[PDB]
Amino acid sequence: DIQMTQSPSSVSASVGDRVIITCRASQGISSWLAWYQQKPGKAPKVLIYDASSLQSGVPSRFSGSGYGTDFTLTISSLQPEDSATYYCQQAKSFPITFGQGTRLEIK
Amino acid sequence: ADYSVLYNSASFSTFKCYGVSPTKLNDLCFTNVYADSFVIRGDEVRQIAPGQTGKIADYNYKLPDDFTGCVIAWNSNNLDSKVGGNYNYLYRLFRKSNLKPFERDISTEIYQAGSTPCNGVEGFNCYFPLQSYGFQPTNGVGYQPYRVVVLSFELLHAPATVCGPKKSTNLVKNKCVNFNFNGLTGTGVLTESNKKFLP
Amino acid sequence: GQTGKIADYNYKLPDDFTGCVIAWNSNNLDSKVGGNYNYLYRLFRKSNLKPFERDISTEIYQAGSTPCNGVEGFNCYFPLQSYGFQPTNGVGYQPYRVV
Amino acid sequence: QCVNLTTRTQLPPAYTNSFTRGVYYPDKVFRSSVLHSTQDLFLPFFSNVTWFHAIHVTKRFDNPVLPFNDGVYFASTEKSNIIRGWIFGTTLDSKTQSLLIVNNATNVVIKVCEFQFCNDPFLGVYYHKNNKSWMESEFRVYSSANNCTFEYVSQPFLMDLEGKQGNFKNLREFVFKNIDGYFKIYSKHTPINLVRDLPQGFSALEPLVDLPIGINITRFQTLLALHRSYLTPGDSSSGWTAGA
Amino acid sequence: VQLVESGGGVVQPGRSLRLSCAASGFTFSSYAFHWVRQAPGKGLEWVAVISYDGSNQYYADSVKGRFTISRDNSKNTLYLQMNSLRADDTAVYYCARDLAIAVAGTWHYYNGMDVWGQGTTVTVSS
Amino acid sequence: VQLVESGGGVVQPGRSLRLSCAASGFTFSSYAFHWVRQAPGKGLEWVAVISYDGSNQYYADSVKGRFTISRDNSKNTLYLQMNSLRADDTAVYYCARDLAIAVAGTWHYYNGMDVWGQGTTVTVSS
Numbered sequence: 001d002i003q004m005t006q007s008p009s010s011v012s013a014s015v016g017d018r019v020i021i022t023c024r025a026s027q028g029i030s031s032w033l034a035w036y037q038q039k040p041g042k043a044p045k046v047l048i049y050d051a052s053s054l055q056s057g058v059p060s061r062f063s064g065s066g067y068g069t070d071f072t073l074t075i076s077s078l079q080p081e082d083s084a085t086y087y088c089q090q091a092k093s094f095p096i097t098f099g100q101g102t103r104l105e106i107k
Numbered sequence: 108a109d110y111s112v113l114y115n116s117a118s119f120s121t122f123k124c125y126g127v128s129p130t131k132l133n134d135l136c137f138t139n140v141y142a143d144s145f146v147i148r149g150d151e152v153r154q155i156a157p158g159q160t161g162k163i164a165d166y167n168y169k170l171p172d173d174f175t176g177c178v179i180a181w182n183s184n185n186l187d188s189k190v191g192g193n194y195n196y197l198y199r200l201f202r203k204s205n206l207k208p209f210e211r212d213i214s215t216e217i218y219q220a221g222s223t224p225c226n227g228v229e230g231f232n233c234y235f236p237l238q239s240y241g242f243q244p245t246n247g248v249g250y251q252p253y254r255v256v257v258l259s260f261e262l263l264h265a266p267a268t269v270c271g272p273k274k275s276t277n278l279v280k281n282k283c284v285n286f287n288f289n290g291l292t293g294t295g296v297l298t299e300s301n302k303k304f305l306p
Numbered sequence: 307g308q309t310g311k312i313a314d315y316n317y318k319l320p321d322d323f324t325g326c327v328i329a330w331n332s333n334n335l336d337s338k339v340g341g342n343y344n345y346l347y348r349l350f351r352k353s354n355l356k357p358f359e360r361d362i363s364t365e366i367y368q369a370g371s372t373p374c375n376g377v378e379g380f381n382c383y384f385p386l387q388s389y390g391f392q393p394t395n396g397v398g399y400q401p402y403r404v405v
Numbered sequence: 406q407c408v409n410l411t412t413r414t415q416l417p418p419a420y421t422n423s424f425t426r427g428v429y430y431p432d433k434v435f436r437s438s439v440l441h442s443t444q445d446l447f448l449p450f451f452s453n454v455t456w457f458h459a460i461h462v463t464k465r466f467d468n469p470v471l472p473f474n475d476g477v478y479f480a481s482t483e484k485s486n487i488i489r490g491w492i493f494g495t496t497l498d499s500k501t502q503s504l505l506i507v508n509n510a511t512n513v514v515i516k517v518c519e520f521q522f523c524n525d526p527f528l529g530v531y532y533h534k535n536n537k538s539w540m541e542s543e544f545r546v547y548s549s550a551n552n553c554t555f556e557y558v559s560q561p562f563l564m565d566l567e568g569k570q571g572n573f574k575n576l577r578e579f580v581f582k583n584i585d586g587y588f589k590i591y592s593k594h595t596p597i598n599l600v601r602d603l604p605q606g607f608s609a610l611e612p613l614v615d616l617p618i619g620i621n622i623t624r625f626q627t628l629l630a631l632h633r634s635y636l637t638p639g640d641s642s643s644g645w646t647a648g649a
Numbered sequence: 650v651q652l653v654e655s656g657g658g659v660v661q662p663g664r665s666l667r668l669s670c671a672a673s674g675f676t677f678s679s680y681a682f683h684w685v686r687q688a689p690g691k692g693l694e695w696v697a698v699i700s701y702d703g704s705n706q707y708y709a710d711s712v713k714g715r716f717t718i719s720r721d722n723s724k725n726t727l728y729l730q731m732n733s734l735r736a737d738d739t740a741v742y743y744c745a746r747d748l749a750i751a752v753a754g755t756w757h758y759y760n761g762m763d764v765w766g767q768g769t770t771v772t773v774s775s
Numbered sequence: 776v777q778l779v780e781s782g783g784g785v786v787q788p789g790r791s792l793r794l795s796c797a798a799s800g801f802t803f804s805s806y807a808f809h810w811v812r813q814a815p816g817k818g819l820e821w822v823a824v825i826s827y828d829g830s831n832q833y834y835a836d837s838v839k840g841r842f843t844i845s846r847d848n849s850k851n852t853l854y855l856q857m858n859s860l861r862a863d864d865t866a867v868y869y870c871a872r873d874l875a876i877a878v879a880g881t882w883h884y885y886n887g888m889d890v891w892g893q894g895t896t897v898t899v900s901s
Binding site for chain 5: 001032034036038043044045046049050055087089091094095096098099100101
């Protein structure tokens with residue numbers, strides 16, 4: 001049962017800022033990570049799947065890559081509509097484990 | 108290359124080998140050693156044997172004939188074949204002729220098997236060359252290719268760069284004997300000294 | 307001393323041999339279409355053998371990879387091995403008769 | 406960075422004499438109270454050895470190129486460790502494997518990678534009060550090393566560690582040879598007290614290192630540290646001195 | 650693509666409940682589904698899954714033994730039976746769908762979550 | 776082990792015919808096969824041979840040019856096509872397997888007949 005971690009828990013930025021989110025897997029899950037962005041009153045939506053792809057329709061501002069243990073999500077511009085929560089997810093096998101959560105703010 | 112760890116602690120069952128066994132290799136001196144590992148049919152992992160024939164991998168991707176190798180066929184369930192799936196074994200499955208060993212023929216084009224190419228439509232007499240193994244968390248060991256390591260037994264004239272012996276024996280004094288230090292051989296009795304050498 | 311070293315696992319001549327070797331072709335009758343396989347040639351031995359020996363002992367030794375105890379799965383088979391004569395062959399694969 | 410420094414002043418090369426110097430142990434065999442006759446590559450007695458100098462007083466930065474025909478006897482006499490290392494190769498265009506013996510900041514490092522040698526490859530150090538250390542921020546010897554075949558790190562030699570410009574005390578001898586795909590380096594250190602030239606004495610050079618590189622060597626260059634300091638204020642590309 | 654959810658209950662002490670999430674806007678018979686819960690303000694948690702054929706089922710560590718899954722292709726709808734109700738089971742459940750990756754003409758599952766429903770706030774009290 | 780044969784013809788004057796023989800109880804791919812002819816009361820005859828891999832196929836002097844043989848290991852069945860049949864083609868056909876001798880682990884074919892089928896009678900007239 002892989003314990004799957006995400007960091008950090010509180011960062012703030014506005015409009016033209018680039019931010020970085022680190023996310024770690026206990027075992028080697030290779031390039032199987034899913035990134036989400038959950039609004040406080042809306043269901044989460046997928047942004048990056050297979051640790052390299054981006055879902056058709058999501059703005060190309062988000063960019064993330066990784067293979068194995070460590071994964072990095074880089075946001076070039078934090079436009080004032082992305083103040084939501086991000087969860088990781090490893091798809092190696094059952095059971096599916098989500099991340100602890102990361103909260104964004106606007107400075 | 109200390110091949111000692113190959114046979115020091117290992118449990119490679121069903122081991123076959125043509126030529127010289129990799130164990131006790133420090134006796135022989137050479138320049139270049141090659142170990143070739145490749146991906147084959149998942150259902151033919153137990154069916155790889157010298158000679159014989161078969162419908163698959165005979166008219167599209169031919170295995171090397173008169174292959175001199177050393178098959179160490181140990182099953183693997185944790186080193187490779189990670190659960191969930193894997194998509195890295197992509198190679199051409201349909202071709203009109205054979206394929207030379209280690210031939211990198213990869214192309215995004217649709218292979219044409221018949222006399223009339225298909226215009227990117229899934230119809231008759233036209234099959235895509237690339238194929239991805241349908242790996243599953245419970246796919247089975249009979250369909251997930253498990254690697255079987257094999258080497259190349261070959262000779263070529265060249266000055267050795269990776270080569271060196273080691274036998275080791277206790278050092279005996281006050282008894283004359285034939286001796287072999289590093290390179291230098293002789294016969295006589297060896298005693299302690301008081302001479303001082305430069306380092 | 308001309309090696310052909312498996313044949314020197316089989317039949318060896320001394321260094322000062324005096325006499326004559328005679329060989330001729332037998333592709334007509336030693337190898338023919340539809341199976342000819344009744345000659346065996348001792349793939350490998352434990353050590354080189356002195357001139358003019360036979361070494362008829364053909365048993366599954368427990369030597370080589372591991373002690374087989376007759377398994378034959380680790381090349382411990384009594385190495386009489388294959389025959390390899392067919393009517394087509396190559397120019398250097400036909401059967402010859404030699405005295 | 407190809408830098409391509411300028412402001413070069415010309416003077417004729419000066420020669421001097423080899424007073425019974427340049428002898429190394431030919432083999433690894435011990436002998437005692439014997440006379441032995443050997444036939445090998447040596448530096449002949451009383452030959453003309455060149456005298457390269459680097460003093461500002463008029464610039465006279467000295468980094469020529471030299472050929473490598475059979476071997477080289479190098480000798481240095483200084484106190485501030487102005488010299489850094491040596492660089493070896495045939496074509497020097499990153500198409501042929503080369504050699505980059507450098508003293509570096511911490512330890513002696515050796516590579517066999519191909520390096521994109523610029524027109525003027527050299528090293529230097531910067532001077533400031535921000536950090537006490539004199540960092541080797543100058544790495545303008547190549548741009549990209551596509552592939553490598555060997556790499557080594559070893560113990561650097563120890564010296565007087567004097568950052569002054571007094572009478573010379575540090576005298577170093579080196580011999581570089583290349584035979585049978587084997588690169589041999591011999592060396593020795595001898596403390597001296599003299600203003601210039603070489604003393605009258607004899608001492609043999611002990612083997613230092615052997616390399617199984619198996620490469621081809623034809624050309625030689627030296628690598629000296631361009632120690633910029635407050636003595637020559639200005640920008641990096643024009644104001645620089647090589648000390649003494 | 651749209652997923653509808655129903656089956657909320659104000660109070661459910663140790664009883665039986667049956668949630669149902671439907672699918673519309675795509676082929677129901679060529680995809681697999683999910684159930685992903687969420688406590689009121691906590692992280693995100695998965696509880697059960699049904700394969701696209703429905704022959705194989707999987708649950709979680711604290712879910713197995715009490716929760717059952719079912720599906721039907723005639724109505725294009727799947728159900729979750731939910732029993733043995735403790736006082737700490739209040740959360741916000743969601744019905745999800747697997748991504749299907751197509752490589753070399755082969756479809757694969759278990760790659761992420763794409764389609765999410767409105768969500769049902771399921772609570773238990775005494 | 777068992778072999779089945781079919782494809783008889785009541786009369787085939789200048790027509791095409793297909794004989795089919797299938798195998799059960801053993802591997803169909805690891806053995807070469809023979810088609811055998813028997814005249815009504817005369818000596819036994821041979822018409823064609825197919826190899827285990829199918830690379831080499833052979834026919835007879837009076838068979839070549841008008842008859843054909845083929846095999847298929849997916850259905851464990853091999854067939855004989857009959858074209859330009861003269862009135863002297865009435866006989867009984869058999870589908871048989873080849874003896875393989877294992878010497879030092881090497882298999883040798885084309886040694887003799889081991890397994891015989893029931894035999895299908897094909898008669899031709901005017």
